[PDB]
Design a protein around this ligand. Sequence first.
Ligand code: PLM
Ligand code: PLM
Lengths: 59, 268, 268, 59, 121, 255, 255, 57, 57
Amino acid sequence: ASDEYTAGGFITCWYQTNIVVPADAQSSCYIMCFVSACNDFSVRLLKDTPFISQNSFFQ
Amino acid sequence: RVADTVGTGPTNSEAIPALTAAETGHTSQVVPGDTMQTRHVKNYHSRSESTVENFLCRSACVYFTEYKNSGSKRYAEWVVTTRQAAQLRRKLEFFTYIRFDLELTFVITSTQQPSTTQNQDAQILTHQIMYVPPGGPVPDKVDSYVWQTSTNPSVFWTEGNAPPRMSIPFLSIGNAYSNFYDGWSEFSRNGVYGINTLNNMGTLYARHVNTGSTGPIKSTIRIYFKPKHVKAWIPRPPRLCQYEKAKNVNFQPSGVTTTRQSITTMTN
Amino acid sequence: RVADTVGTGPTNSEAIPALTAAETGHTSQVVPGDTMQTRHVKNYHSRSESTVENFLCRSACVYFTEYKNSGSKRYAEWVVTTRQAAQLRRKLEFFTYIRFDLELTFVITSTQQPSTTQNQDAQILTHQIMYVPPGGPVPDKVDSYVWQTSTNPSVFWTEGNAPPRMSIPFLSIGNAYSNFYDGWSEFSRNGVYGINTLNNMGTLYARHVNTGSTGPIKSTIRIYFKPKHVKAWIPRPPRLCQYEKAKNVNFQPSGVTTTRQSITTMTN
Amino acid sequence: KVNSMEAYQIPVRSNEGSGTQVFGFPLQPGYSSVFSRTLLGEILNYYTHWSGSIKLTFM
Amino acid sequence: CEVPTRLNSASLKQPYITQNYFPVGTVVEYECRPGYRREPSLSPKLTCLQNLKWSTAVEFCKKKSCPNPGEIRNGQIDVPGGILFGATISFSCNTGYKLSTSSFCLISGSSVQWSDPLPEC
Amino acid sequence: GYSDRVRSITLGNSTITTQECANVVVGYGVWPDYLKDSEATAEDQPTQPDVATCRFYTLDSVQWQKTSPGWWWKLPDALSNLGLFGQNMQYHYLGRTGYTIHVQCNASKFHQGCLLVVCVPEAEMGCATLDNTPSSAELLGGDAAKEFAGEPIASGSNKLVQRVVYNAGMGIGVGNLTIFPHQWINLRTNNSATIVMPYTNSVPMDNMFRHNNITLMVIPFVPLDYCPGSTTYVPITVTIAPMCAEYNGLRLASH
Amino acid sequence: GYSDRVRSITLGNSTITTQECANVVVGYGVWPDYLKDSEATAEDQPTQPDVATCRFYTLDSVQWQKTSPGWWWKLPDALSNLGLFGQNMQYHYLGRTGYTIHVQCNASKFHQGCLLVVCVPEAEMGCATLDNTPSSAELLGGDAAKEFAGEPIASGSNKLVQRVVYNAGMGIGVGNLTIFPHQWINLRTNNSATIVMPYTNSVPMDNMFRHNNITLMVIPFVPLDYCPGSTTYVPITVTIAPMCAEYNGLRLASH
Amino acid sequence: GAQVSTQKTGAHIHYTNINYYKDAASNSATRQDFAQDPGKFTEPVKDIMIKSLPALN
Amino acid sequence: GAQVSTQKTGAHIHYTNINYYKDAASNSATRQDFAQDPGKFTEPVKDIMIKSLPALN
Ligand SMILES: CCCCCCCCCCCCCCCC(=O)O
Ligand SMILES: CCCCCCCCCCCCCCCC(=O)O
């Protein structure tokens, strides 16, 4: 959860140089990002997801 | 035990651990010591609470219904299904096929209803919970002959005691439970479509064995399911949308996530 | 076992055991046999009740709250904190950092409230106590869906039975608990200041699972904390002043001790 | 953009400047809206403590 | 079906408010109450299902954020509860200066603004 | 010497060659095989054609446009009317096979885009109306491809399938699908993607006409783009080869 | 297998990757190291931060135009105000370090050009007026790059540096500079050039604020050229990492 | 016929278990099976991929 | 797998203990750890100080 004591940091990306595109080639591109846990990853206290919800028993 | 970090130093080689192609779909097995200098620290952390068992091995209410000692509704019935609630359903839906034993627990609570009958001195109520396997004689009335429970299993509980609990083995004609089904009841691709076709767990009934008092009383039974000896296969993504029905996966379309100000915003 | 005394005799030497300098801060390790003649007596006394465990290993009420079966307040909540009471707080504050397992015990008692409803014949009340870890879905109402307690831990108790008790491990992201903190929530030295910043133990809820009777009833739950497996570091002086708040150490100034007649008075 | 696939594309194009920013977000897998619904985030939201390294792959 | 479920964030759209008969398969739409801002991912619609029960409902709106408080000269601002709709900031002064004392984020027109302006100290 | 960007696959009387390929994904690390004697339940002897059934079948092609949401295919249904495979699964009551999927796209060095190619086991889908269930025609497209929809399908008294691309018709997250054996076609890196899938099910054999085990989903995550002057028609082709296929319960043909 | 066109460099908490690189030039065949006990002169113990000081610092970028003469950088001056390196050399009286220089340029297969990237030790420069000497501001540019001039600087009563590109401000020959460890960036062959320089001086340590040991000179020998339609803004970036840095004589900060 | 096994304790003391029923579905839960093999989901490829080498060469 | 230990009796007769749960946080309290070392609080000085000798000489 959001706690200012356990702050994480900031992740940013910047243009190092400039995109170099030849004539007759689109100059607007897209990047994609994937995230994965490392070998040292670990979690430690079962709880209930905030997202799941219900107003009354289904069917 | 989780893997400890390894100490490394500077490097000017031709080894390119960071550069890779995700077109293959192979997740890169890089560690922090590959793209920076690291210290060697022993890691004593443990993935003991992340095992499938510890994850699904908790009691969760899957239904509750109310029956009275007078009037019309004298007994209660429930068609066994784990899709009635949202929390346990969403925890179970992480996997395509699951095999698990079940620890059932029942909580029964009574309440006096508003009336006008004078001189009310009740006695202790006893409850009977009868399970009928599919194909059995379902009770048609509260004083039905079927309540004999010769072959059928039954549990009798007197109010004021500890809640009843029993253990049920892996019941299935298949080799594992199916959380999802992509087929039809008939071979002609018509009729019931979905996990409803596979479902066939029978019906559960409940009644007051005695009236107890001359005044009205309403009882409510709560069903709790704790999975144990869990084995699971083929994981799948968690339900982004909210559930709507118990017999089907029908949903209302929703966005992937929640919107922020711009692509350079550190706050929600 | 405590150290036995040693028999000594007269002395006319140059050894000066009594004379010392307390400027160093070294506590003098002199025994009575150094400044007088003593007999040799074996000492069988034992410091077994002075150990950290035996000191803090006792049940102590840290909070109690009241909820009803009708009206507005249908359920009760409490943000976990050991600073609510004075006795256990002052016993714990002897040390800067403490690491300990917790044995929680709950006492629940009901009471009939004055009304005018005739023909009151109640049934046995059952109570549910649900613990929500921080970040969980807190109940917004008494018939909330969150009460399913799938992942969340819960305890169900029927009145007339033995009080519920469970054991909680050392929960902390650090390596020890902190009774005192000298810092701010933000790195800019602004915002919350004190032990409140470190606190993050979640919230505890409680409700009646059934109305029970047509008349009003108020229940009160009491929380008891017994520390076990205690390990402590850096001792500090006991609280001379009286406590005022739970989130901070703010106090009203008080004298060091109580005043007598003169400096040569043998009485209080 | 969350109601389409455009939520997954990072738009980098050639410009007459250098050193500008592409994106930035905090390291809060459980709380940040960016990582909340990822597999890692959906698994974290069932727990209370997390500890380990994070891998980000940019294609 | 009965009356649609009440939600703190949004309010039933006109004219559904003045309607008491809802057949099965009837859709109702909501709208964000002041200040509350609409959430683009969630859609504010509910359908009466066959069981005469409305579809699952979640907060379709979120509290609006008041502007940044600023920086009072020779003064310290205390923000215990964020800067969302309904929060309260506290204005204090340093040792050696004399100073309103508090400001409240309230709906003023079509957006939310602070009440008392920054004092002088 | 060798490179690793060239790969040939030979099955039956068919061969597939590739000059720009990524690796080959192998299911869940399991290679398809036959059924063992200690895990079977049906008692009559199975038939194993092994040549005609185990060959590359090439379905139709689909045009990839600047605004295409994506396509999906049910493999037991896709090959139902094609070759001996269709005749075998038609007469027989029970069937068991593993599917190898090869999806190929061709472009230049001036074209850009990205496809996700994923095999979903048990892809149960939903309906536009919350009450009611989807029709067989909407869920199953044979000899053709079904297309997702960019915008939500309207709810009325209908049996149409919810085709939203962001919910993949299952209400889940399209990004999280990677949990299933998948691959990418990045037009700057690889022309084709190959996935080998074993037989996944909860029972040893199953009727191949009423249950569809796996579903192939080709979804463009980055739209196709090019500058005027270059080719505007870019098709996508899918070749499916059944592997280790065995059948049981010979009965009158089912239409 | 391997190629030799890919190279990664890791220093401190920073990493540099390259897909099209030539070899790595190593100074005069000497790798930077620390000072030995048999060659030191100062007697107090040195400080060796070794992590924060030894990391990649990225200066600003410069646009390469069809008519750019070239740029030069004084390394002790360039990193003077950047990071702990600047704070260390500020408080201390003596310093000793080796500099690794990475210069990167990005383009297409339709762009042409050629840069010489050279490290000159003791690049003493001249003044437009024969009498008088150049001003510190003209010789040293911090947080920025100094540019050469295509045509000769006018002589008057001024302290301006002679910036003629053909004389490199030293009056010598630009072609003969290759005697210094250098590299080329040919836009048809390599994106970046990397040079590793040890500590060269006539004394063991030296004050890093009044003497600049080496100077980096990036000079386009063949002008940038392209046809209309392709990208017109092509920047050049320089990353410098100090190596084996030690300091002596802690004293009050010098501004 | 009892089983003695180690408990879950912190890093940096045995327990006893007897089965009373005869169905093997009535035993306690198996909470101490710490075995992993993420090579089926991560790295499901056919040809091995060494980390330091280029992926496509 | 039981533990037999001595009890707390007066100066001048064994007890038996079995653990039933598998968490090591559910055991009883450790009441019999009689170990002391007051040299950290009393006498924390660097140079040793003999009792009979003068402190500052
Ligand atoms: C004396 C009372 C006995 C009650 C017995 C109830 C048995 C219920 C069995 C339920 C098994 C789990 C069903 C899972 C369904 C599924 O996921 O396909
Ligand atoms: C079924 C009910 C479960 C209730 C669980 C309650 C857990 C409370 C944990 C409290 C731990 C001790 C807190 C110490 C705080 C401190 O000193 O920093």
